[PDB]
Each structure stands twice: as structure tokens, then as C-alpha cells.
Amino acid sequence: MEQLLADYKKGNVILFVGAGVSMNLGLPSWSQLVDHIATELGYDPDIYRTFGSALELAEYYKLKKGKIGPLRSWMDRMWHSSDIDINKSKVHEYIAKANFPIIYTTNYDRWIETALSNYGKEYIKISSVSDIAKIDNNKTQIIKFHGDFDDDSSIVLDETSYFQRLEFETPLDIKFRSDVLGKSVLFIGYSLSDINIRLLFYKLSKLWKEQKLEEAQPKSYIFLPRPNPIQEEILEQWRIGMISSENDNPGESLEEFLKNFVLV
């Protein structure tokens, strides 16, 4: 915990962020992403959930519609609605005022980009290797790990694309390995509960420790509200620490957790 702030002073940590910061803003959840594209298919919103894990709805919807295009356009329209304000969410602005040089997101929206643009931080968003080139050493570099809505090809919403992301052959993963060959990863909002995710971590886990060679692959940490012993004992064998609070409401717990990085 203290070593995270010590390396955050030296800038040897990489922010990694999931949907846990995205549930605070009133964004559409994955449950209505199941309700839609089922009622847009002829199904009941329920009753598919007997046979599904929601990547299987993304499979069945892109298989019946032929492309991932209508699903991409629908989530781009709902995820970037007019009534939702960036400024009524302290966690996004706490990310914005912090000093993070490299930040990786698995979310597909651009609320982190508008959070950095709203507080005068100069960002160059990158998703395709191409962009990799344009990295303002200075400007923070936000990296869409699972793609964005401006690229229909490499966007990862589906079980086939999630299975293409097993062996990490895409050069964004190579850039991630090159970025974290001497640094740490701070994971936010990632409920170690869904196998895939867990797995994602696993594979990832490798990356660092993978090359325990010399270095020290600066430890890595995740932040969860619940302090369970199973996940910390499991995660400590992958060279990953565990950080939890005593507050039970997750939004306020994440706000007071990011408050440590706001003032430093």
C-alpha cells in the first residue's frame, strides 16, 4: 500500500481501470446490454439468461446480424448520451488530477478522455498500433486495451475476440509488456469473480513476474471494497498485492482511495 505511493512519487506505476469507475455515472450496465439486443432480436429480455454469459449474446447478435456494427453503434449511442455529465463523478476527476503517465482501460467509452480534456490535461488516445507512434512522451497516454468505438475491427465485445486476446499477439499487448517491464500495475474496478477476467489477469500476471529476472517487477496491486482472504492469498502467488478499505459503499470507497493519489 505504502510502496504504491512511493513508486507513484517516482512514477513507476501504471493505472489500469475497468468498469468499476463507470458504474457510478449512471451508464448502461451489462444487464440492459443483455435486455437490449434480445428485445432487438425478438427475444424476451429474460429467458436468454438460461443459456448465456452475455458474451454469448454478443456472439448470437453478431452472428444473426452478420457484423458487430449495430451493437457498436447502439453502445456508442447509449454510452455517450446527452444527459450524463462527466463532472458529477468524483472518481473520474480524481483520476484526472492525478499524475499518471500511462493509463490502460478495458472500457470502450471515452469518458476518461473527456475527463482528461475537461481538466486541461493533454492526452493522445491510442488504440491501433499506428497511433502507438504518436506518443507525446509528455502528454499522458491513454491506451484502449479492448479497443474503442472508432474501430470496428479490433473492438473486443465478443467471445471470439476475447478468445483472440488469449495469446496476446496484438502489438498493444507487446507495448504493454514493454511498458511494464520495469513498472507496476494498479488495477481498478475489476471484480475478480468472472473467470475470464480472472484469467485475463492470470495471463497478464505472467507478463511481469514472467521476467522476475533481476528487476523486481515492482509489485502490483488491485483495489476491491471487500477484504476477502481467498483472493489476496490467490493473487499473492502471481506477484500481485491486495488493497481494501473498511467502507462498504463502493463509490465512496473508491473516492477516498483515489484521494491518496490526488494530493500526491
Binding site: 427475444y43 424476451d44 429474460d46 429467458i47 438460461t50
Partner: protein
């Protein structure tokens, strides 16, 4: 076209085979067990019972549930009609409410049907009255107390015309009407 049914009462499948004779659909029995939740919203009860049934078979299936709605009890039966029935029994129920000031109750059977595309809800209704004494056999449910409006005998007494005047007969009539037009 076959429609599955998940029950343990073996007279039910032959009864609805007699009801739906010549309707173009046969009814197949399932011998599994569904642990129903006990919530006073009977629509949510039939919804998650239908969800558990489609989890069990995955074919076109339907579920049914029989409830009560007593005006003097403000509809406290319904989602726990079965629990109320075996926790009270016939004589105690009769002296509790048949001797009371308001024996007006509404007996309703809610049928939830899923055709592997959507779910459909059918409900029947029958206004009844509470007898102060159990009459006839005490074998099947609260038929020994349930006196309808316009008649005198409790539902355990007449034999066969209770299968024509029940609320589940009317719900099966709307269900039979729905399947007989092609299920559009």
C-alpha cells in the same frame, strides 16, 4: 407440437390432456422438482418458476400456480396460499373465516407459458365464499371449504362440474384460445 409440463401430481397431466384434446398439442410430463420462492407477488412467482422450468427442459413449457385473494385478509393469500393452507387446515380455516363477517375471497390461478421466444401470462378468476364447515372430501386442496357465488356446495362435493366452473378452467380456456389461433 408438444408442450412440456413440470408437475408431480399425475392426475394433472391426464386432466389437461382431457382439456386440450383435439387442440393440436399434446402435453408431456416432467418429473423434476422446482423449488419455488415464496413471494406475495404471484406474477414474480410464476415468472421465476417459468424461468426455472425453462432452465430444466429448454423446450416449450408452462407452469401453473393456484392462489387466493381474501378481501377480509386484504389478499394475504396468493403467493403463500399453499403455506396458509397446510399451516391452518380445513376446520381451523372454517372457524376462522367462515364464522367471520367477510367470507368474500377471490380464487385465482395464474399460468405462465414460455414458447422459447417469449413468456406469456394467463390468469383465471373465480369469486367465492368461505364455508364455516368442511364439506365433502378433504383430499385435494381447499375444495372442501370453497363455495362459489351463485351455488351452495363446496368445490369438493359436485365431482365433475368444478372442472368446468373453476378459475383454472377459464385460464386454460384463454390459453387454449391462444394456442388455437397459432400462438401469434
Amino acid at each position: 407440437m408438444n408442450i412440456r409440463f413440470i408437475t408431480r401430481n399425475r392426475h394433472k397431466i391426464k386432466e389437461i390432456n382431457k382439456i386440450l384434446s383435439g387442440t393440436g398439442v399434446v402435453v408431456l410430463a416432467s418429473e423434476h422438482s422446482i423449488d419455488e420462492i415464496q413471494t406475495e407477488n404471484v406474477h414474480a412467482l410464476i415468472k421465476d418458476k417459468l424461468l426455472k422450468a425453462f432452465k430444466l427442459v429448454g423446450r416449450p413449457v408452462f407452469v401453473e400456480h393456484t392462489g387466493l385473494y381474501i378481501e377480509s385478509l386484504n389478499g394475504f393469500p396468493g403467493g403463500l396460499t399453499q403455506i396458509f393452507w397446510d399451516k391452518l387446515q380445513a376446520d381451523k380455516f372454517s372457524q376462522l373465516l367462515g364464522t367471520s363477517e367477510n367470507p368474500r375471497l377471490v380464487a385465482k390461478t395464474i399460468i405462465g407459458y414460455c414458447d422459447s421466444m417469449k413468456i406469456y401470462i394467463f390468469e383465471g378468476e373465480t369469486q367465492g365464499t368461505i364455508s364455516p364447515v368442511p364439506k365433502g372430501p378433504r383430499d385435494f386442496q381447499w375444495d372442501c371449504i370453497f363455495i362459489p357465488d351463485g351455488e351452495s356446495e363446496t368445490f369438493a362435493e359436485m365431482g365433475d362440474r368444478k372442472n368446468e366452473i373453476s378459475m383454472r378452467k377459464k385460464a386454460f380456456d384463454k390459453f387454449k384460445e391462444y394456442l388455437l389461433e397459432g400462438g401469434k
